[PDB]
């Protein structure tokens, strides 16, 4: 696999229309948001996820585009499946002994699924596959402005087994984010890539999944989700000649002359990027 | 702490060649860890006088040197820092004009068992040893220089 | 008591303003399954300046829901409500740690008082 | 050990005393002293001949038994069992 | 029989009305050794009367009373148990042997238990979590029996506070009202999430109990949260637990900034005693 | 290898944005903080063992430049392979009795791996290999303001073995920092470096790895972690000219007026470096 | 009172194929989060006289007190530094007040905005009494 031979880095913007982009686990079902100033949040792994779903509707299940974590699976099975694939015995918690052979059941892993090549997993279980780092990482995404989550009350006029007044028979609950334009940082890294065999034919469908990660996420709660820009810098050298803090200062998130009352749209915010360092080059086409 | 003594070296052969002198302290069997356990906040009040010795001078008078201690006490001076017995535990000593303060153990009779009371560097630094009985927290030793306790 | 009307606080005083709003709808509106306190008590002590000013327009509402009924305890809670925002002379963009520490005090310490019977 | 410098001489014991930590003695049929050193190490002496000790490796204490008289076994048989569950 | 004499001296009466044979006027003596590579050393020494050393002993464990945890425990902790819940990983080794001789010491002496008591258990605390690898049944607690027993017995002892032997609703003392509001805050998280793999026992004790201002309200919030999917979910009357959190904040007017070691102290004994309160108040 | 002739102090600031910097293993894998004072903090170890990441990602296992302290390696194995090139017979516990002999062994050791030529490192393993000092040390890293961890909650759509839990999905849960600028303090003893080696080149790989030490280490809980400032001040003779604390005070950190409410860029902080005494410069460069 | 804090750590290799049969240890590592402490010393002429330990002895020492620290720096001592250093020359070839009452004019207590535990020397105010007529006073830090 001809892993990639320069360092990227991307930030992508996307906004949520009445829409729950993320919810809390532990909290409800409220919309994450930062304790401290109110600005939303989404969690990396939401958008990994969204980036396998693409994934795995455009490939279908192709040869070396499966997905590991897939959905309700049994991940175990899967790592037997490589040690069979290998010729070795898993039967031990621990790696085989034999560098080579826990050398080879890993690179089989990488080679055969698509996300493990690319975010990386940890598959030490009673059936023991190693770790791999991941040459593509993304931080949370936060909101450039404050939101103010919203809980819309919705009746239901059925009933599951049985009412008590058998009148407000059923009451629901519904989060939604009137508006949030929210901001993911990434970092690709070469080294990662030649130890997993990240080529470029993945980085083009990653890209490609970044730019319609939404357009087949739709949902009853979800809202109306988009991306709107996606910058990409890419470096002239596999180890990179640029602060990552440096290339993301670049891009620039402002009102401009919409400041009256919230922001309801995009319309409402204005993106700028300045020009790179000497040995960086941006393309924003995406 | 450490294990042994510096040993003697003869000067004239320091420089016969150049000898680097040391003592590692962290070298193997060097390093002597000894636990130590001693007291704390401690307080006494000490009883003594004097005496001439052969070689006391013609003019030598114990008065005189009683005056110079006395005081030396009321000033603070001191020849060194005393210490509770280690150097490491300096001694705060001052002189008792007045009468000497109640003690904790004002009610008790304690027997503490034999402990040393002085070494006769005389006979070969022979240690001599006295029945310490606690009275009244006060402690009364024989005489180290009397005939009877010596051998 | 407890509870101290002269703390004169910013945090002590939104916690009381949050107390005697979620006691206000609780009373206009019984047998609700969420009250105000388990929906925009993460909102309000994040950025109180944003959401505070739509959690009065519901007190409001609710209030109103109750005053038409002859038995008008509403007005009360109207009164508290103009007492507290008296002290302020304007809400806070954020609050610290110890600051919404003291707004969970005060908001506790006023929802006492107002279940004495 | 020092009783390889010195071997079956006497001058083993001046040695041994000088340097050993607390000395023991066995009265039982054939007189035993025993100079214990650090290290675990055990010197023991009867007249001229003497037998040298390692107190962590059995074999060690399983030739002292040897070396020693038969009366005498039989009263370190206790002292023998204690060394010997050194492991 | 041992049982009978240890609850007689605990009370303050004599060993002798138990059992007459004691002559309490002869003296024992109690010595201890601690070795090190091939020479060993003396580390306490006591001469005191049966009597005298025997009603310290009991003075000792009157000091040490708490309400016991679970039924199992020893109403008499033993030495060993109190010194081995200080040590690193909950195994003999590790204890420092200082710890030790300031124990079977200060035992048997009726001093002042050794200044560095309290922090170590403290740290014990701080850095003690739920264990459920160990394979016993009960997800083990941060705050044991045997620590809060040490920690009461220090702060009775050093420091000449008072503390009961089980809850008092009426302490209205800052420090004991801050470990009660802890766990109760405990109770409703894992009431609202049951089999948690963690609560905020293994992380947020120690942080609340030095330093409660900067901490208890992600605490309180996050409480709000349990309750309010408490009050969804059956046990819709949660109503209880907030109830409780109104009573014990009410006798609180700020949150301390920083709170001292022993009030720190006071602090787990609050916590281990409402804790016990509410295992099966419902 | 000539080894420097100057002491040298520097002052780091890094800083993390919806990241962990360090797990605490006590506290589950909350960031370590200070529990009286609610500062977080960064192990020594945790940044020494960046920049032997950094280190060995730059230099590739080169020549006079491996690093001991490796992933998997047994340490052991690597004593043997000292003494082999040695040319000595190892006994168990103790060192060549020749102390020439356990000085060749450890200038070995220390002049083929870069790490121990550096933190130093301690070999007195069941086989000896001696000790070594090194000669850069680094203290604790303590945020400038009290951190405010939080917890996020997060869940899988996956189960690792056979189970019938889900009937909700697996759970999890991430711990970071919503932001915290550290402050790094660390040494650099000529005297040591004259023992172990520790060159003028090594000193400009230490600058470049401390520079670019968190370019290269992102992950799924790390976030975006930078290093914003590195001053270094440099002494004239082999023993310094100015107590340290004196010099580490000329860094003074402090939020800037035009900032209100919770820390979440570095643009809310203002650094400024005073005057150095007349035997030291400050390299204010970096 | 100090409170010394216990932090874990790990180890990414093990020492020994024994233990490699996961591949990993979990030490530990005490810390003083801070702590100012005193340290008395006393200096007897008359001893020196017996020694030969003369002034430019004196000047050394002065300088080893204040740089002790500045050469110690190591994994686990972290950052210490000296802070002050008090001098007490007496005039007379032996003293001329009590010690103990000399070091109780070196008076360390905590500055007024300072509350809740110690974290820098900022929070520590120092005074130094007036000595007595007999000795002098220097102030080397």
């Given at each position: 696999?001809?892993?990639?031979?320069?360092?990227?880095?991307?930030?992508?913007?996307?906004?949520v229309?009445?829409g729950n982009p993320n919810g809390d686990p532990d909290a409800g079902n409220m919309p994450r948001i930062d304790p401290e100033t109110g600005h939303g949040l989404v969690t990396?792994?939401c958008?990994?996820?969204?980036?396998?779903?693409?994934?795995?509707?455009?490939?279908?299940?192709?040869?070396?585009?499966?997905?590991?974590?897939?959905?309700?699976?049994?991940?175990?099975?899967?790592?037997?499946?490589?040690?069979?694939?290998?010729?070795?015995?898993?039967?031990?918690?621990?790696?085989?002994?034999?560098?080579?052979?826990?050398?080879?059941?890993?690179?089989?892993?990488?080679?055969?699924?698509?996300?493990?090549?690319?975010?990386?997993?940890?598959?030490?279980?009673?059936?023991?596959?190693?770790?791999?780092?991941?040459?593509?990482?993304?931080?949370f995404a936060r909101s450039?402005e404050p939101v103010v989550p919203q809980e819309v009350s919705?009746?239901?006029?059925?009933?599951?087994?049985?009412?008590?007044?058998?009148?407000?028979?059923?009451?629901?609950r519904k989060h939604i984010v009137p508006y949030g334009?929210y901001?993911?940082?990434?970092?690709?890294?070469?080294?990662?890539?030649?130890?997993?065999?990240?080529?470029?034919?993945?980085?083009?469908?990653?890209?490609?999944?970044?730019?319609?990660?939404?357009?087949?996420?739709?949902?009853?709660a979800?809202?109306?989700?988009?991306?709107?820009?996606?910058?990409?810098?890419?470096?002239?050298?596999?180890?990179?000649?640029?602060?990552?803090?440096?290339?993301?200062?670049?891009?620039?998130?402002?009102?401009?002359?919409?400041?009256?009352?919230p922001?309801?749209?995009?319309?409402?915010?204005?993106?700028?990027?300045?020009?790179?360092?000497?040995?960086?080059?941006?393309?924003?086409?995406? | 702490?450490?294990?042994?003594?510096?040993?003697?070296?003869?000067?004239?052969?320091?420089?016969?060649?150049?000898?680097?002198?040391?003592?590692?302290?962290?070298?193997?069997?060097?390093?002597?860890?000894?636990?130590?356990?001693?007291?704390?906040?401690?307080?006494?009040?000490?009883?003594?006088?004097?005496?001439?010795?052969?070689?006391?001078?013609?003019?030598?008078?114990?008065?005189?040197?009683?005056?110079?201690?006395?005081?030396?006490?009321?000033?603070?001076?001191?020849?060194?820092?005393?210490?509770?017995?280690?150097?490491?535990?300096?001694?705060?000593?001052?002189?008792?004009?007045?009468?000497?303060?109640?003690?904790?153990?004002?009610?008790?009779?304690?027997?503490?068992?034999?402990?040393?009371?002085?070494?006769?560097?005389?006979?070969?630094?022979?240690?001599?040893?006295?029945?310490?009985?606690?009275?009244?927290?006060?402690?009364?030793?024989?005489?180290?220089?009397?005939?009877?306790?010596?051998? | 008591?407890?509870?101290?009307?002269?703390?004169?606080?910013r945090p002590y005083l939104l916690g009381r303003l949050f107390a005697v709003l979620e006691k206000?709808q609780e009373?206009?509106?019984?047998?609700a399954n969420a009250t105000i306190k388990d929906r925009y008590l993460a909102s309000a002590s994040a950025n109180p300046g944003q959401v505070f000013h739509m959690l009065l327009k519901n007190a409001?509402?609710?209030?109103?829901?109750?005053?038409?009924?002859?038995?008008?305890?509403?007005?009360?809670?109207?009164?508290?409500?103009?007492?507290?925002?008296?002290?302020?002379?304007?809400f806070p963009v954020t609050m610290s740690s110890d600051e919404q520490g003291l707004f969970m005090i005060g908001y506790y310490?006023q929802r006492?008082?107002?279940?004495?019977? | 050990?020092?009783?390889?410098?010195?071997?079956?001489?006497?001058?083993?014991?001046?040695?041994?005393?000088?340097?050993?930590?607390?000395?023991?003695?066995?009265?039982?049929?054939?007189?035993?002293?025993?100079?214990?050193?650090?290290?675990?190490?055990?010197?023991?002496?009867?007249?001229?001949?003497?037998?040298?000790?390692?107190?962590?490796?059995?074999?060690?204490?399983?030739?002292?038994?040897?070396?020693?008289?038969?009366?005498?076994?039989?009263?370190?048989?206790?002292?023998?069992?204690?060394?010997?569950?050194?492991? | 029989?041992?049982?009978?004499?240890?609850?007689?001296?605990?009370?303050?009466?004599?060993?002798?009305?138990?059992?007459?044979?004691?002559?309490?006027?002869?003296?024992?003596?109690?010595?201890?050794?601690?070795?090190?590579?091939?020479?060993?050393?003396?580390?306490?020494?006591?001469?005191?009367?049966?009597?005298?050393?025997?009603?310290?002993?009991?003075?000792?464990?009157?000091?040490?009373?708490?309400?016991?945890?679970?039924?199992?425990?020893?109403?008499?902790?033993?030495?060993?148990?109190?010194?081995?819940?200080?040590?690193?990983?909950?195994?003999?080794?590790?204890?420092?042997?200082?710890?030790?001789?300031?124990?079977?010491?200060?035992?048997?002496?009726?001093?002042?238990?050794?200044?560095?008591?309290?922090?170590?258990?403290?740290?014990?605390?701080?850095?003690?979590?739920?264990?459920?690898?160990?394979?016993?049944?009960?997800?083990?607690?941060?705050?044991?029996?045997?620590?809060?027993?040490?920690?009461?017995?220090?702060?009775?002892?050093?420091?000449?506070?008072?503390?009961?032997?089980?809850?008092?609703?009426?302490?209205?003392?800052?420090?004991?009202?801050?470990?009660?509001?802890?766990?109760?805050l405990?109770?409703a998280q894992?009431?609202a999430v049951?089999?948690?793999?963690?609560?905020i026992?293994?992380?947020y004790?120690?942080?609340?109990?030095?330093?409660?201002?900067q901490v208890f309200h992600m605490l309180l919030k996050n409480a709000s949260n349990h309750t309010a999917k408490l009050r969804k979910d059956?046990?819709?009357?949660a109503?209880?637990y907030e109830?409780?959190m109104?009573?014990?904040i009410?006798?609180?007017?700020?949150f301390?900034?920083?709170?001292?070691?022993?009030?720190?102290?006071?602090?787990?004994?609050?916590?281990?005693?409402?804790?016990?309160?509410?295992?099966?108040?419902?």
């Open positions: 696999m001809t892993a990639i031979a320069n360092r990227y880095e991307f930030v992508l913007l996307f906004d229309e009445n990396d792994v958008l990994k996820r969204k980036i396998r779903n693409h994934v795995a509707l455009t490939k279908e299940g192709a040869e070396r585009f499966n997905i590991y974590i897939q959905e309700k699976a049994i991940l175990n099975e899967t790592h037997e499946r490589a040690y069979t694939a290998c010729d070795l015995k898993p039967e031990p918690k621990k790696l085989p002994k034999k560098v080579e052979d826990a050398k080879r059941v890993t690179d089989w892993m990488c080679t055969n699924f698509y996300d493990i090549r690319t975010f990386g997993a940890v598959m030490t279980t009673e059936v023991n596959c190693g770790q791999v780092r991941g040459p593509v990482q993304m931080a450039v919705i009746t239901r006029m059925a009933v599951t087994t049985k009412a008590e007044a058998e009148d407000n028979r059923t009451m629901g334009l901001v993911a940082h990434g970092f690709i890294s070469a080294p990662l890539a030649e130890k997993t065999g990240f080529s470029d034919e993945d980085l083009t469908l990653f890209w490609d999944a970044l730019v319609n990660m939404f357009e087949h996420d739709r949902s009853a979800r809202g109306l989700m988009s991306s709107r820009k996606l910058i990409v810098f890419k470096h002239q050298n596999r180890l990179g000649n640029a602060p990552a803090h440096k290339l993301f200062d670049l891009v620039k998130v402002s009102r401009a002359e919409g400041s009256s009352g922001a309801r749209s995009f319309a409402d915010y204005a993106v700028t990027v300045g020009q790179a360092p000497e040995g960086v080059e941006v393309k924003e086409m995406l | 702490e450490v294990s042994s003594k510096i040993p003697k070296p003869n000067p004239a052969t320091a420089m016969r060649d150049r000898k680097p002198l040391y003592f590692l302290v962290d070298d193997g069997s060097n390093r002597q860890q000894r636990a130590a356990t001693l007291l704390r906040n401690v307080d006494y009040v000490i009883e003594a006088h004097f005496e001439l010795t052969d070689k006391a001078g013609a003019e030598d008078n114990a008065g005189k040197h009683l005056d110079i201690f006395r005081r030396r006490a009321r000033a603070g001076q001191s020849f060194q820092q005393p210490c509770l017995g280690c150097r490491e535990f300096p001694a705060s000593f001052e002189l008792l004009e007045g009468d000497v303060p109640l003690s904790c153990y004002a009610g008790e009779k304690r027997d503490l068992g034999y402990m040393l009371l002085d070494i006769d560097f005389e006979r070969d630094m022979t240690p001599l040893f006295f029945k310490a009985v606690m009275e009244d927290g006060v402690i009364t030793p024989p005489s180290r220089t009397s005939p009877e306790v010596r051998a | 008591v407890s509870l101290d009307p002269a703390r004169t606080d206000a009373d206009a509106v019984p047998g409001s509402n609710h209030t109103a829901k109750l005053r038409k009924d002859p038995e008008r305890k509403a007005i009360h809670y109207e009164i508290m409500m103009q007492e507290i925002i008296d002290n302020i002379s304007d310490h006492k008082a107002l279940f004495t019977k | 050990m020092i009783a390889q410098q010195h071997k079956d001489t006497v001058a083993a014991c001046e040695a041994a005393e000088a340097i050993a930590i607390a000395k023991d003695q066995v009265w039982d049929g054939e007189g035993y002293t025993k100079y214990t050193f650090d290290d675990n190490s055990v010197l023991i002496q009867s007249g001229t001949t003497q037998y040298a000790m390692d107190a962590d490796d059995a074999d060690s204490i399983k030739g002292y038994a040897d070396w020693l008289d038969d009366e005498a076994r039989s009263a370190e048989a206790s002292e023998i069992e204690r060394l010997l569950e050194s492991v | 029989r041992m049982h009978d004499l240890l609850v007689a001296i605990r009370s303050g009466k004599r060993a002798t009305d138990i059992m007459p044979d004691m002559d309490e006027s002869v003296r024992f003596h109690v010595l201890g050794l601690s070795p090190n590579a091939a020479r060993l050393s003396v580390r306490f020494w006591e001469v005191d009367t049966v009597g005298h050393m025997l009603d310290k002993v009991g003075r000792h464990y009157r000091e040490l009373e708490i309400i016991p945890q679970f039924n199992n425990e020893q109403e008499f902790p033993s030495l060993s148990t109190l010194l081995r819940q200080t040590a690193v990983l909950n195994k003999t080794e590790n204890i420092s042997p200082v710890l030790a001789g300031g124990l079977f010491r200060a035992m048997l002496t009726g001093g002042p238990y050794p200044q560095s008591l309290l922090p170590a258990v403290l740290g014990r605390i701080r850095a003690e979590h739920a264990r459920p690898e160990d394979k016993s049944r009960y997800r083990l607690e941060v705050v044991t029996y045997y620590r809060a027993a040490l920690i009461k017995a220090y702060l009775i002892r050093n420091r000449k506070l008072e503390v009961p032997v089980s809850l008092d609703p009426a302490r209205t003392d800052r420090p004991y009202l801050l470990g009660r509001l802890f766990a109760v405990e109770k894992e009431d049951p089999g948690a793999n963690a609560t026992k293994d992380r004790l120690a942080s609340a109990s030095a330093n409660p201002g059956p046990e819709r009357k109503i209880h109830i409780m109104q009573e014990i009410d006798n609180i007017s700020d301390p900034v920083t709170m001292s070691s022993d009030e720190q102290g006071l602090f787990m004994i609050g916590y281990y005693h409402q804790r016990k309160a509410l295992f099966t108040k419902k």
